[PDB]
Amino acid sequence: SMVACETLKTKKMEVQIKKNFPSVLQYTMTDGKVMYGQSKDVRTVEINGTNIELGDDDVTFKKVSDTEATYTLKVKDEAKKIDAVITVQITVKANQLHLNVTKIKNNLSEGIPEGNGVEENAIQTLSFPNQSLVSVRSSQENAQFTGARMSSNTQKPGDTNFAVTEDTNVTDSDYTYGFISGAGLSAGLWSNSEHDGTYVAAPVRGGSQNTRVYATTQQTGDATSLGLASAPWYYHRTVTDSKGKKYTVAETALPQMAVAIAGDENEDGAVNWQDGAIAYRDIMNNPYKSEEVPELVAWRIAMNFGSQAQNPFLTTLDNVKKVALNTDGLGQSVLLKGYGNEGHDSGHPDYGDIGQRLGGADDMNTMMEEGSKYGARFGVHVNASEMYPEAKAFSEDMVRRNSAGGLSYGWNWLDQGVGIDGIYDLASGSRVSRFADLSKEVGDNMDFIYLDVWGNLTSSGSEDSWETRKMSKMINDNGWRMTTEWGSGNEYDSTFQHWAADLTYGGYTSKGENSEVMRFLRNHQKDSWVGDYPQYGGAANAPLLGGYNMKDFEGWQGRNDYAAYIKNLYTHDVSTKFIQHFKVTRWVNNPLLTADNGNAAAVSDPNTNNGNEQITLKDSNGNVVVVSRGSNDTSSAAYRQRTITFNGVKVASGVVSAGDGSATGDESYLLPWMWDSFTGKLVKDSEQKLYHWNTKGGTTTWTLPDSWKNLSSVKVYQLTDQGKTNEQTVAVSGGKVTLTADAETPYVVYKGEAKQIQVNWSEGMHVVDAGFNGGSNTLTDNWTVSGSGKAEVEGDNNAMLRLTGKVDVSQRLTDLKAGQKYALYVGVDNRSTGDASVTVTSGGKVLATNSTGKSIAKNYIKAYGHNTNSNTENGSSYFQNMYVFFTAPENGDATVTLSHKSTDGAHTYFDDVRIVENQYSGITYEKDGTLKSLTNGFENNAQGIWPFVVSGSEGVEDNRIHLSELHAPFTRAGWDVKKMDDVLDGTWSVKVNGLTQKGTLVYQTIPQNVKFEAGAKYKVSFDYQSGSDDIYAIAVGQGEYSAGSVKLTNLKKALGETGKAEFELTGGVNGDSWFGIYSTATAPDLQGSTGNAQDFGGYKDFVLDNLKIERIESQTRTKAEAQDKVKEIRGKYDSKRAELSDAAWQQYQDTLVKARVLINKNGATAEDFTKAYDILVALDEYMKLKDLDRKLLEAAMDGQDDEVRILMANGADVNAADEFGTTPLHLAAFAGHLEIVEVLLKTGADVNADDVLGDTPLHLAAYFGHLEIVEVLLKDGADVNAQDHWGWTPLHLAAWWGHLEIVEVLLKHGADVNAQDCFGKTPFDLAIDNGNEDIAEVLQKAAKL
């Protein structure tokens, strides 16, 4: 009663606690060992940064039971506006002691006012300065401290290990983790503190800097005592948004902290942080759903972008089944980047808007539900830092503004991104409500959230651990596992970092967590470490625990190589995941830790593995894994040699193939995969299996696990994208097996005969095997083939249907809704002159059909599986979607047929048969089945910009063309600095963002989408908005786009007000006519806008809506008029044979011969005579413009100034070019015709035009040395550092051709003197070979500056 101390007891320890303060005097373990707490009378409580010392009257004590005591602390300071009552609980269980703040009463406040209003006098922070919950002294045997801080740098360890001596002096030294050891005991301190502090290396904030342990020294008699305390806790924090508005936000959780006292837990004869770390796992926070991390063998990204629907959800489910077959059912983790709105970086931050063109929430739920049966987990990429005007969440309150009141702009790509006010988004409850919208859609089906960019300071200048903890909480509260971008981010709750798992990003300073303490504690809970990537060195040079190496094959950054994806899983990820099924118990001889980097007391042992690195791991059943390094010397070939043992038996050995792709290794393994792909429980003894891999290929012998020792044989299967193949029965003798393996080929070993994993391809897709993933057998079991030709499944990467000759491939459609409207589209690449078709039939009769002749447009969709960088045939891909539209029959009898009509040997490729509900009804046909009219408001587009297809203005790219969406007023002209409407009519339009000055096609129709019959006339019209005059043009062409072979009509500015365009088109003789939008060489008028306003304004954009194409009546012609038109054309051009290109004459003869076929056919009609006449009229206007172009080239070359002015007035194109790209400007600059150069530039000639060799007019101005022409070109915007085919800048051609004063002019305008030719030649080296002495010394003076 009078005694100022009490005792709490467990079966493991007795703790003496003080009655006048929640402090421990000491912990006494059952064996008599003692650990100190706070030996001194320290009664400090910090509130809001003010230290208050408590007296006897400020504390009441109550011993609740033998395991618990409660304290009531009166914490008061009138001068600092603090009057609080803190209730503190101390509880003990086993070797653990918990200290919890269970109640905080503020006497100076009524609470947080509604809506998170400011709470005056709020208790914002709380801590117990120098509480010393556990402590060690310099007088104790082997007294030491081990601490960890965040490091994303492979060369800078995050740990410190030092002896605690009389000279140790620290005051609130902060760490993520801190452990003290001394006198045979070790302990770590755990806290839920959101404090941010000291770190070793990190490129971002976002929870990277969370330090929760404070170490402080004090004198205890003649010894120095080092004590551990919790870092401060946030309670009711007051924050400010980007507009100056203040809020008080309640605590994420109440303050909590704990210690766990360890003896020699790993039984190795030494007591250090590792023993404390083993006990620490019993008290530490564990990231939500971290127990499934060892199961996630196959991580990858499935991408959608720019309205294209490259990866609809039901296709993602088929790719999950393909990976399940190839890995024998290992767990997967599929990150859906672009699951929402129009795709990736569209619709942020509308978390609940699931991409309707992908199949919406219904297909997403089917993919998640069915995928989970194959151990596949799914998650979505979200952004809480940047938003687009189209998102319904976009509002003035959501907008982050700068100190001047302007928008905090983000990135412009498809649309202009704007920063989100992170503090407003949290304190208003907006973000959590948007996550609730997504929760209503996915229920409990979704595994995780991937939070992009958090920590890069785009939402505010803070994004601290407190904000990150609340962000992770609102996500975990919906049943979602937390994952994020940056390697160092969110130490508290993240189970995956993209910049840790994908080792190629960021470089050596910005990878996963480089800490032995953190990885010892949590390797099994996260994919947030440093894997093998030897060019980074240090931590990335063959980590013994491996580390996740992530590759993709579904479009992310153009990644499409399935074989490389699977090879990578077996090379690094199977052993990494195997190791994660065990927890580290011992880690000695770490070569990254030295006396020089603050780790003199690092855990060492010369009697373990020759004094080289070794890690021991164990599971809860007592299974033991030992991972050993061959040598600790990085110069030794043995540094990268690793052996893995499972229960004393070797299961892996050798050097892994370098994680950076630089060198193949020799590693082989026979890993026992004992777990299921769901919760990771042990599978039944009979279905236990082994995975075999042999990097170089060959024969290796292995000792089987103990439970296999009495078998006489095993079954071995080679794993492919079809599952288990090539079964072999391999004898077992003396419990050993010998395996012959091909290089880099996976095998699975079973005790007896194994069954094939059952796969029903394309569930929910209305056809079986819509992606041709079922091998050759799919053409027997699923699709029916008929005809004399050939149908085969081709392609070692993304398999396709390949047709040759006359062949039909059919399949009945299932699960259609009778009477409902459907679109059916299929990817088609036709290399044949004969038609490739898609037909839907019902009871023998045709409901819908469509065809394409030879494909004319290459595929430039980077996230798509058959873009032109994927080699469908001959190093290209012309894959484009071909649509049919039908109403599902009442009889429920519908069949799709894919066919090749011609009997030639050329190929047709098909892939991804997609049957989708769709209400589009804008096509009308003539009685013959030809086009009568096509209208499109883009309101019912199944995907893409149909009837247009993205062209090559940006090469294979995540193309800056998509379907724009209405969200007034933010998407309309007049909001902020925006001058163009995103949408012209309804909710959707086709938008082109900033594709100015490309001098090439942006998008075009193709015949499979809109067929223009040979000789027929069509009126085409559309509504548009264009940012400036003549930046975009209407293009009309025939066949595959060829520069010079198209008709261009510049469009005038329509900025903020919708313009109307209309023109006529006559179909070309080959049925391959098209129209599109073209980016000219004309510079946009930015109207004095600067910075982000140049992109957000719309000056460089083009929006198109309400397309209308209609067949029109043409004046009727007789056979005689058509024949006379032939004679007129022949009289005008038959003589110009020599005056024409060999290709120009053949194109002329082709049109002529084909027009005559129409005229002279037996039974021809007035329609044929009219078509032949219209074809000849179009041919006439084309040949007449070609002649004016070559006459303008001749007049610019020969210096006929008057001829140039009159030729352009008649119709010569100022940007005309010969077969080799030589323009009139190239010709006048080379010839020295200054006035012609100026007139051409005034008319709109492209100053930076390239010829086939990359030579610009400025390059050609250096052959003779025209000084005045170089000045004019430079003044008009010529690139002074333009490099041609041989790497020569204009400076290299002037010095090589010996023209001194041109060089002087080039050097003045900013021609970088450091620039190197295709050889090792600077402009100085070019003058040495041509005697240009005065040039050499002049640029030598400029280079020294």
Binding site: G1221, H1226, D1251, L1253, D1255, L1260, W1286
Partner: peptide, 9 residues
Amino acid sequence: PFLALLAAX
């Protein structure tokens, strides 16, 4: 006259 035949001289 583009670079090809110009270089050749």
